[PDB]
């Protein structure tokens, strides 16, 4: 529920720790258009503890959320946000046309159109340095086939769903190899021997 | 090729059908590992 | 490198087949102004 | 029952999240083929 969300070229990571995480208040809300888990199932989150908790957060079009699924390929999955293949965690998304689309075309939001190579899982990359798409060397800020490596979404509320902007969160976490620090709302009991 | 080798960890982290597909892997492998042991054992019993 | 292009009121089509689409001569050539592909990234059309 | 018997031709056609499922078939079938050979060799070796 933060005021503003990042462009997917600069997705914001919040580390969650030393606290009780009730997930019922997330999963039981209809206010999320998607809640898809991988290495766990959504109803089971309250039956677990987590050794760290990760909440990567950004915006993207409704018609590219499919690429956020782990081990896929395509511009988002290849150049701007990579999940590791064993991803244990859940992906959350909701429409944001009424908070984050604009009739001018909301050019506040960018993504990495080009890059040197496929980025590592959870690598993040702000670099504006010009991409040399054809086999020429290229200097300064411009040239034929020399691309500024970010491109912008057109977001207008008159554009349809799939064109519209979504806020997205990925809850990434790790289990049973380390000390717990986040746990479910479940209550303890007097330890018999 | 399951998420884990701990059977109670798979049953904690997943529901009735997502746990089932993952447990069937452990059943397959474990069955094959115990069959390999019983084959080595019957052959060693014939030597002894 | 044709002498006469069509006009967009009746745009031409030609079918290209049985052959090699060697885009190195195409894509690297600074004779063009703008180039945009919507299904696929430019470098790997040489492979796909 | 995989799409191919050539390991590099699986990897050159499918993306990793399902190329792994084909490779797992070939791993299972080839591991079953070694186990059949080694069982045959052990039983024969007891005869010899």
Curated annotation (Swiss-Prot), chain C:
Highest taxon, organism lineage: Viruses
Effect after changing residue 29 to L: In strain: Omicron/BA.1
Effect of residue 1 to Q: Reduced viral infectivity
Glycosylated residue positions: 1
Known partners and oligomeric status: Binds to host ACE2. RBD also interacts with the N-linked glycan on 'Asn-90' of ACE2. Cleavage of S generates a polybasic C-terminal sequence on S1 that binds to host Neuropilin-1 (NRP1) and Neuropilin-2 (NRP2) receptors. Interacts with host integrin alpha-5/beta-1 (ITGA5:ITGB1) and with ACE2 in complex with integrin alpha-5/beta-1 (ITGA5:ITGB1). May interact via cytoplasmic c-terminus with M protein. May interact (via N-terminus) with host bilirubin and biliverdin, thereby preventing antibody binding to the SARS-CoV-2 spike NTD via an allosteric mechanism.
Function: Attaches the virion to the cell membrane by interacting with host receptor, initiating the infection. The major receptor is host ACE2. When S2/S2' has been cleaved, binding to the receptor triggers direct fusion at the cell membrane. When S2/S2' has not been cleaved, binding to the receptor results in internalization of the virus by endocytosis using host TFRC and GRM2 and leading to fusion of the virion membrane with the host endosomal membrane. Alternatively, may use NRP1/NRP2 and integrin as entry receptors.
Protein's UniProt name: Spike protein S1
């Amino acid at each position: 529920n933060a005021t503003r969300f990042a462009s997917v070229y600069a997705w914001n990571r919040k580390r969650i720790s030393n606290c009780v995480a009730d997930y019922s208040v997330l999963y039981n809300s209809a206010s999320f258009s998607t809640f898809k888990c991988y290495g766990v199932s959504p109803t089971k989150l309250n039956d677990l503890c987590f050794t760290n908790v990760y909440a990567d957060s950004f915006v993207i079009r409704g018609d590219e959320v499919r690429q956020i699924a782990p081990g896929q390929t395509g511009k988002i999955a290849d150049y701007n946000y990579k999940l590791p293949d064993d991803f244990t965690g859940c992906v959350i998304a909701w429409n944001s046309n009424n908070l984050d689309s604009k009739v001018g075309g909301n050019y506040n939001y960018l993504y990495r159109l080009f890059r040197k190579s496929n980025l590592k899982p959870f690598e993040r990359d702000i670099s504006t340095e010009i991409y040399q798409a054809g086999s020429t060397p290229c200097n300064g800020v411009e040239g034929f086939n020399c691309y500024f490596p970010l491109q912008s979404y057109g977001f207008q509320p008159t554009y349809g769903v799939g064109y519209q902007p979504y806020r997205v969160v990925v809850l990434s976490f790790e289990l049973l190899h380390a000390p717990a620090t986040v746990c479910g709302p479940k209550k303890s009991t007097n330890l018999v021997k | 090729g399951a998420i884990s080798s701990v059977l109670n960890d798979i049953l904690a982290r997943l529901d009735k059908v997502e746990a089932e597909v993952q447990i069937d892997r452990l059943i397959t492998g474990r069955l094959q590992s115990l069959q390999t042991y019983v084959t080595q054992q019957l052959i060693r019993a014939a030597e002894i």
